[PDB]
Amino acid sequence: QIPASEQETLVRPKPLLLKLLKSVGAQKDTYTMKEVLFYLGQYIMTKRLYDEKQQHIVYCSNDLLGDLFGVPSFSVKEHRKIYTMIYRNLVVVN
Numbered sequence: 092q093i094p095a096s097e098q099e100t101l102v103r104p105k106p107l108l109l110k111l112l113k114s115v116g117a118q119k120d121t122y123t124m125k126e127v128l129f130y131l132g133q134y135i136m137t138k139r140l141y142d143e144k145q146q147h148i149v150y151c152s153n154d155l156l157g158d159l160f161g162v163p164s165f166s167v168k169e170h171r172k173i174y175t176m177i178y179r180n181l182v183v184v185n
């Protein structure tokens with residue numbers, strides 16, 4: 092269970108995550124986690140990596156997203172795992 096404050100977290104993406112973000116949004120130095128989740132969602136949706144009618148699984152073994160996250164697939168319901176996969180591709184700033 093994810094507290095609402097998580098979305099406010101300010102982050103500086105590492106180069107591979109920044110590459111992915113630049114294919115769907117404007118480049119800038121710092122993003123909120125709300126922005127990162129939105130942009131990665133749009134990346135997934137636009138590239139049709141998500142099978143909503145197949146156990147809510149994103150399939151990313153044939154995509155740079157798979158290299159970012161280090162998995163061939165994952166469930167969009169496993170929220171803490173998603174946060175952890177994302178965190179390892181950025182630096183939190185405060």
Ligand SMILES: O=C(O)CN1CC[C@H]2[C@@H]1[C@H](c1cccc(Cl)c1)[C@]1(C(=O)Nc3cc(Cl)ccc31)N2CC1CC1
Nearest residue numbers: 128129131132135136141149167168169170171173174
């Ligand atoms: O129904 C749910 O439980 C979550 N939802 C399932 C559908 C939405 C959303 C999910 C999400 C929102 C917020 C926090 C978290 Cl951890 C995950 C999200 C999203 O909004 N951004 C994002 C980013 C990544 Cl990397 C993976 C999945 C998603 N989905 C986008 C669809 C293209 C898959």
